[PDB]
Amino acid sequence: PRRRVIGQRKILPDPKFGSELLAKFVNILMVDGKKSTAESIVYSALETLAQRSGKSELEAFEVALENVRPTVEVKSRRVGGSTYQVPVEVRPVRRNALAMRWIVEAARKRGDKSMALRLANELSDAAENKGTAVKKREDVHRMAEANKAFA
Amino acid sequence: RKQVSDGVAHIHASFNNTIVTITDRQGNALGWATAGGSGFRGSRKSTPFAAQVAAERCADAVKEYGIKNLEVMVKGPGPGRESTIRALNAAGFRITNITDVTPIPHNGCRPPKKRR
Amino acid sequence: IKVRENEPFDVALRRFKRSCEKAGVLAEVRRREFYEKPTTERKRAKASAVKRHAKKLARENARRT
Amino acid sequence: FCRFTAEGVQEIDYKDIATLKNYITESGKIVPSRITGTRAKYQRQLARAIKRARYLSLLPYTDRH
RNA sequence: CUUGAGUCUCGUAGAGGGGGGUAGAAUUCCAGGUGUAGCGGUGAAAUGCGUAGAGAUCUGGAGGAAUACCGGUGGCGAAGGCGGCCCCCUGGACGAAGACUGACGCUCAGGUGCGAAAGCGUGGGGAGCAAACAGGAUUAGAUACCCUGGUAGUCCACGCCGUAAACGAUGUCGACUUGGAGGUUGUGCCCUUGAGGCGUGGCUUCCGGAGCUAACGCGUUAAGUCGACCGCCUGGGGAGUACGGCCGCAAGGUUAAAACUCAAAUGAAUUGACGGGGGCCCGCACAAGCGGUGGAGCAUGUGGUUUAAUUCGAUGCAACGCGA
RNA sequence: ACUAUGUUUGU
Ligand SMILES: CN[C@@H]1[C@@H](O[C@H]2O[C@H](CO)[C@@H](N)[C@H](O)[C@H]2O)O[C@H]2C[C@@H](N)[C@@H](O[C@H]3[C@H](O)[C@@H](O)[C@H](N)C[C@@H]3N)O[C@@H]2[C@@H]1O
Ligand SMILES: CN[C@@H]1[C@@H](O[C@H]2O[C@H](CO)[C@@H](N)[C@H](O)[C@H]2O)O[C@H]2C[C@@H](N)[C@@H](O[C@H]3[C@H](O)[C@@H](O)[C@H](N)C[C@@H]3N)O[C@@H]2[C@@H]1O
Ligand SMILES: [Mg+2]
Ligand SMILES: [Mg+2]
Ligand SMILES: [Mg+2]
Ligand SMILES: [Mg+2]
Ligand SMILES: [Mg+2]
Ligand SMILES: [Mg+2]
Ligand SMILES: [Mg+2]
Ligand SMILES: [Mg+2]
Ligand SMILES: [Mg+2]
Ligand SMILES: [Mg+2]
Ligand SMILES: [Mg+2]
Ligand SMILES: [Mg+2]
Ligand SMILES: [Mg+2]
Ligand SMILES: [Mg+2]
Ligand SMILES: [Mg+2]
Ligand SMILES: [Mg+2]
Ligand SMILES: [Mg+2]
Ligand SMILES: [Mg+2]
């Protein structure tokens, strides 16, 4: 905000794998405070990702995040009456936040039988760079490439 | 496609667009590129980045002449009067001298009226 | 303005960008982009002289710094 | 300070190109008296001599002839 | 008679004026070379220009206009105004020392002259800019602002006009009345030791004392203290208009009312408020997010419509699951 | 970039 600078809220890591990063992803996927329901969804989806990929849950998850993490984003800024989109380098913490949010929204959209199946499917397609979340990160990189004339 | 080893880089920088022209040291143009020609229509045409892209697009398509040393004659105001030179040096050219050739009258013709 | 460059290109670009700045070519161009009525030219010169009349002895104050 | 009043030159000669050069910039522009320290009387004589020398092509009007 | 006024001797600074000549930069155009798909323009565009070769770049040429830097609350001129350089003709100002004339002065109604820009007439010229005009935009409209062009005009000679916020909104002349900091231009003396110190003039800028002023502010360059003469004002509109006269080719200028109507119209300053003024700082104000409403059905409250009554009240935020 | 307007009259 204007003056008060925030100290980050601390997140307790996930039980099954003890990952700070994964616990955040459960939070991104949590709906209506049902963290138990969200925890099962990503725990189920992660283990089918493990079986259908070959690596561990964390390694498979990391691969999908890497293909979805953005590097540069646009922000509508102003000088006079300009309103250009300005490309800015994403800070590392926001890169993971954007990747997790993009994966979750893509997983919700791609209609399957279960959310864990939806999440597992989108997570796999992200690993091979075919997912809608990968599509959105391509659009962001494309959109920030067009407006690279501003800095 | 005769070989030229010594070229002149004319940067016509203006508030709306940047024109880069590589000539030999007798004035004959060998190749050219403009910010508005390299994409960058509208507001993106008048940015230093677009001028830098024009310098690259001009360094290439004149590479066939095999120029290695460039005089630089930058003319006019505009965002693309230093980005073009930096891009020219980044393109593998040895800049020999940089000259500002902006036409300055000595109280000659009357300029247009101020915009309101 | 006619800057022949020494070994480093970047220091030459600074030398050129400085040589132009002292020549005031950009200020020359921005002023000649449009016609200024002699009323405006005299009014601008007089206003500049008034502000150029900045008394440097006005720093005689405590201010509790 | 003013060199011309220091030596009591009393007429600035347009034919003295050597001393005329240290009153014009690299582009050939006449340097203001507020930079060279010349007095107003000699600055007017200096400008006339430089313009005369420019006409006789002993000094350049600009650096881009 | 010499103090005011003027003349002579020497010198100084100056965009002072008039008439010629000339230089460089730049724009435009013409011709050509290289070269290629854009250029140009804007908030964004489009009109426009461009493969019939644009724009860019280079060479040559033509022409007009204006003189970058110097350049300066610098200078000169009565004012309007005047700045590239050179020559010719020419005005004024100032300083030093004397000599000369001996109130020859000040002001000035009428009168006369000069008098920005625009405009007008005749003849030239015409690069750039540009009223008008055209097109493209913008917009509810856009007879504008913006863009692309573009005629008169802007330039020259001669002749008109005679007006400007022609302003310092401050008539001219003279005298007197604390200071400080500069600028410009002379001049005396002294250690000139070198651009210095101490005087003395002219013209200029800022600040400020007394005094004055409604206040702002002016303040030795007065809006202070006085004297001479002139011009002008008598509430706001009507109206600097009509009519008449004079002037003008015209545009119009100048001189200049009345009826009628109002109780104000004004100046300066103060407090606030406001600004598509500035600065600084805040707020789920944006930004970053999450979840909603606006669509459905129902509940409930409002309008309205209906009714015999649909009781009354709450209506921007701050009424509408509100009094209830 | 660029919007316009705000009926009359009181304490
Ligand atoms: C040197 N005196 C100046 C005078 O000079 C004028 O008459 C002189 C006669 O020889 C000329 N040499 C000069 O060229 C000319 O300009 O002009 C007036 C103008 C007037 N509006 C006021 O402005 C002031 C404002 O009223 C005020 O508000 C502001 N703060 C400061 C201003 N000076 O005070 C000055 C000052 O009295
Ligand atoms: C000695 N310094 C200076 C002197 O210089 C010359 O003085 C001598 C001649 O006399 C020469 N021997 C010397 O070599 C030379 O340097 O010229 C005078 C000129 C005079 N109008 C006045 O102007 C000032 C006035 O005070 C005033 O007019 C304005 N406010 C500011 C001016 N500078 O004060 C200076 C000052 O006295
Ligand atoms: Mg006698
Ligand atoms: Mg009279
Ligand atoms: Mg006359
Ligand atoms: Mg005229
Ligand atoms: Mg005429
Ligand atoms: Mg126009
Ligand atoms: Mg008048
Ligand atoms: Mg005037
Ligand atoms: Mg008056
Ligand atoms: Mg004062
Ligand atoms: Mg008064
Ligand atoms: Mg009349
Ligand atoms: Mg928000
Ligand atoms: Mg609803
Ligand atoms: Mg509805
Ligand atoms: Mg009711
Ligand atoms: Mg009611
Ligand atoms: Mg209306």
- Report how far apart, in Å, the C-alpha atoms of A15 and of each of A12, A28, A30, D13 are: 9, 16, 16, 94
Cβ B69 vs Cβ B5: under 8 Å = yes
Q: At what angle do helices A92-109 and A115-127 cross, to 10 degrees?
A: 130
Number of C-beta neighbours around residue C64 at 10 A: 4
State the DSSP H helix or E strand holding residue A67, giving kind and residue range, or none if neither: helix A57-68
| Ligand at shortest distance from the CA of C39 | 10
Record the tokens describing residue D37, joined without a space: 């320290």
Experimental method: cryo-EM
Domain housing D30 = 1-65
Cβ A49 vs Cβ A123: under 8 Å = yes
Across the strands, what pairs with B6?
A: B69
CA distance C43 to chain B (A): 16
Stated in angstroms, how far is C59 CA from E224 C1'?
33
Q: Which nucleotides of E are covered by protein (CB under 7 A)?
A: 13-15, 22-27, 33-45, 54-59, 64-74, 84-86, 127-131, 145-147, 183-186, 194-195, 206, 281-291
Q: Does C2 touch chain B (CB under 8 A)?
A: yes
Record the tokens describing residue A90, joined without a space: 């994403």
- Centroid of ligand 16 to alpha carbon of A30 (angstroms): 27
Domain definitions of chain B by residue range:
2-116
How far does CA A138 lie from the centroid of its chain?
13
The C-alpha angle with vertex A27 and arms to A23 and A30, in degrees rounded to 5, equals 130
Domain definitions of chain C by residue range:
1-54
What is the residue type of A10? Answer: K
Q: How far apart are alpha carbons B67 and D13 in whole angstroms? A: 48
Give me the number of domains chain D comprises: 1
Domain A20-147 adopts which CATH fold?
Answer: Ribosomal Protein S7 (1.10.455)
Q: How far apart are alpha carbons B43 and B50 in whole angstroms? A: 10
The C-alpha angle with vertex B49 and arms to B46 and B53, in degrees rounded to 5, equals 105
